[PDB]
Design a protein around this ligand. Sequence first.
Ligand SMILES: Cc1cc2nc3c(=O)[nH]c(=O)nc-3n(C[C@H](O)[C@H](O)[C@H](O)COP(=O)(O)OP(=O)(O)OC[C@H]3O[C@@H](n4cnc5c(N)ncnc54)[C@H](O)[C@@H]3O)c2cc1C
Length: 285
Amino acid sequence: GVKEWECEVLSNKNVSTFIKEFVVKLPEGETMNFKSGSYAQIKIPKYNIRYADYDIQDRFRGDWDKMDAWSLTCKNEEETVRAYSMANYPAEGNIITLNVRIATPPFDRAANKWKAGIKPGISSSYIFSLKPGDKVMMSGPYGDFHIQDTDAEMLYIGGGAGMAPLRAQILHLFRTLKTGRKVSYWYGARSKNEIFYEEDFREIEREFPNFKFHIALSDPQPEDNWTGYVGFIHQVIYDNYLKDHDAPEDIEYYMCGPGPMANAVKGMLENLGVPRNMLFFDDFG
Ligand SMILES: Cc1cc2nc3c(=O)[nH]c(=O)nc-3n(C[C@H](O)[C@H](O)[C@H](O)COP(=O)(O)OP(=O)(O)OC[C@H]3O[C@@H](n4cnc5c(N)ncnc54)[C@H](O)[C@@H]3O)c2cc1C
């Protein structure tokens, strides 16, 4: 039993192909005190929705056409609660920003459809239907995933909607603390179109020599005209930075992203002789 507001939705626009930037506001003069990397919880009610009702911009709708995502529907028959990480820094109290990955079902290559009779994500699917002016019930903060009090080097590894916690921590580190720690953020996206929040970080690195941001694309598309790093995030990170680093084991690793990306990083660190307690992982489950 924890703190709960009803919030108005300011903005639910697509920020990549499958991540909406979901922005809600607390009642006037209300505020959520949280530490960066904590998460909140949305009440998802009973409901019904067709994916054909979703608002997607010209440049993101392309993959939805390909996969026939517009044909999906989702019925939720029991009220529930779901976790989403805060993506803005704690200095903004009543405009909470979230990053929501729409949980499409598995794609059954055998019939070239989605695996039949499997429901999409009852929570992500509801949030995606939300529009400016709507109301959501939200509680927080929760969670333990926080910056360590050290002078240590930090290396951030993000993937997918795992942007949320890192960005909150990195924004806190540089916009409010104005830290002197050395900090790199390596974010992996499938292609150029799927990057977001880039300028936020280009700004920071222009003000702080001690911060670097690198993007690595796993499946770059011809239209990207892509001159930068390419491949798996852990491969990119190891190939360029770590391999030649004097002491990888003195670094704190903050990562958030999907199971494959995390596990492949874990296995990499392990061989590299980095001890488990130097890795801080926020598990989206
Ligand atoms: C601490 C924490 C923080 C988190 N922060 C974020 C965040 O900041 N942003 C974010 O996007 N997510 C975050 N997550 C994940 C998020 O909470 C949800 O898990 C995510 O939104 C998907 O849940 P859902 O209700 O939308 O889908 P669910 O109904 O939970 O289903 C998830 C997926 O499973 C599939 N599925 C359902 N049944 C089957 C089946 N029978 N066989 C095969 N597949 C099936 C669905 O198609 C769907 O793709 C966080 C999780 C935790 C624990």
